[PDB]
Structure 1
Amino acid sequence: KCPFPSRPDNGFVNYPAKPTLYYKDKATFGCHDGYSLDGPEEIECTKLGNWSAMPSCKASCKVPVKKATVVYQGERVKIQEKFKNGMLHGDKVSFFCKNKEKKCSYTEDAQCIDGTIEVPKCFKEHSSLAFWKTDASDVKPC
């Protein structure tokens, strides 16, 4: 015997329609808009009497700045364009930062994790109004 697995938060679950689920019986998961599955989509019930896993639904992220060039999968892009529809949990990007000492730039990664993506501390976004200031993404790389 296995119990009925609970619907994951911000998602849903499906299983055979029947009084009791015994073993080798399957359950199955999906998520609402703005979330994505973190774990296997299907799950077996096991010999020991418990469920082979328990996936959750992890939230997507608002792009956390109005404008930035970042590296994604090895390629410079504009975060606003590339992720106009938000960021999936697990999506990793790289913001540019200035080493003012050696007058060059370097990158630091940030990841969407369940709705929060923490932009790095070294990163300063500049309005296009502050035209005297220079985007780290244009400084020669260290």
Structure 2
Amino acid sequence: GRTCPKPDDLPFSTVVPLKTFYEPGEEITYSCKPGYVSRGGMRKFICPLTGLWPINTLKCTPRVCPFAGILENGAVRYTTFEYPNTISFSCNTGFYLNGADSAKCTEEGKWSPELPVCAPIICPPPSIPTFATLRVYKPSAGNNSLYRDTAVFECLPQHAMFGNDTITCTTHGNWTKLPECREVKCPFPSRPDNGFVNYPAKPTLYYKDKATFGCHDGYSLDGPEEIECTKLGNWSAMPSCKASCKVPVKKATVVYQGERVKIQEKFKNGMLHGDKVSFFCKNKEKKCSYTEDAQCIDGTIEVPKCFKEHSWKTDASDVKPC
């Protein structure tokens, strides 16, 4: 007689027993694959005398895991919440992921691992270094600090901080490197020849202590009036007193700091150590005028050879430039 032929392969299903032909009266069973379900479940069929498998209503669809698109204080990456898909998690700034960063919809239609949670990153109160106080610190969570909170140390008087005064609460719930505070001392500074030095009346001199210098008349400082004890045990500078120069000529228009001046007028009480000036000289060939420089160095200034002071003719200073 007739036989039923090989049964149709339906999506996400298996047939048992699967043969290429069946005698009338034999049974087959469609089941959905693991991870899938159908309206009606298993369909059984018996090969009829006609050899025609009847019509199969079985539609197998993925198990759907419970909705997981919202992570408080974070983000979920997903397409669909159905077997066998994966979803990823990450947290907003200042939170850490408390749990696995991904989960799968199992053939049983639950999440594996369990869904995680975002929690606030926190550090405990930080430690004071030795010979330091805590200027800026107030807990922002209980008595703990939140991510990217800061604390600031100042050293004790006579102490230089090596490192940095500001620590930050890290992702790892620990703070950044603490700075060190050490006592630092400087020598007494030397009185300069032709000058004097003032510093405070005490036996040892410490970090951030100041000395001031001065000069006798006809002398001026070749560096700053004020110096301090640096963190490296020395001084900012050690200035000397140097001789002023007498005006090297009687009358001359010169450049001083980009601007023409009468050297007689500008330097009536002499020139200080370092005062630079430019005299005007004539190029007799091209009947035009150039400058050369001249500096007061410790009571000496060399007026250029090319310069000619005029005791009716024209001064270099009054001639067109070259």
Give the secondary-structure state (helix, strand or coil) at the position aligned to 2:277.
strand
TM (norm. structure 2) is 0.39
Identical counterparts, % of pairs:
100
Cα deviation, 1:56-98, whole Å, max 9, x if unaligned, reads 1222111101121212233333211221111122222211111
Runs of at least 5 residues in structure 1 that lack an aligned partner in the other structure: 127-131
Greater strand fraction, Structure 1 or Structure 2: 2
Give the secondary-structure state (helix, strand or coil) at the position aligned to 2:233.
coil
TM (norm. structure 1) is 0.82
Taking a change above 3 Å as real, the CA distance of residues 40 and 77 of structure 1, as seen in their structure-2 partners, is closer
Runs of at least 5 residues in structure 2 that lack an aligned partner in the other structure: 1-184
1:13 is displaced (CA, Å) by: 0.5
Taking a change above 3 Å as real, the CA distance of residues 8 and 141 of structure 1, as seen in their structure-2 partners, is same
Taking a change above 3 Å as real, the CA distance of residues 73 and 46 of structure 1, as seen in their structure-2 partners, is closer
- Computed over aligned residues only, the root mean square deviation of the Cα atoms, in angstroms, reads 2.0
Alignment of 1:43-62 (within 5 A): 43-62=227-246
Count of residue correspondences: 137
1:133 is displaced (CA, Å) by: 4.8
Aligned partners of 1:119 and 1:31: how far apart in 2?
26
Specify the alignment match of 1:103 in structure 2: 287
More deviation, 132-141/91-100: 132-141
Taking a change above 3 Å as real, the CA distance of residues 50 and 74 of structure 1, as seen in their structure-2 partners, is closer
Task: With a CA cutoff of 8 Å and minimum separation of 6, indicate the structure with the bigger relative contact order.
Answer: 1
Aligned partners of 1:109 and 1:67: how far apart in 2?
17
Aligned partners of 1:74 and 1:27: how far apart in 2?
34
Aligned partners of 2:317 and 2:187: how far apart in 1?
53
Cα deviation, 1:40-70, whole Å, max 9, x if unaligned, reads 2222223333223211122211110112121
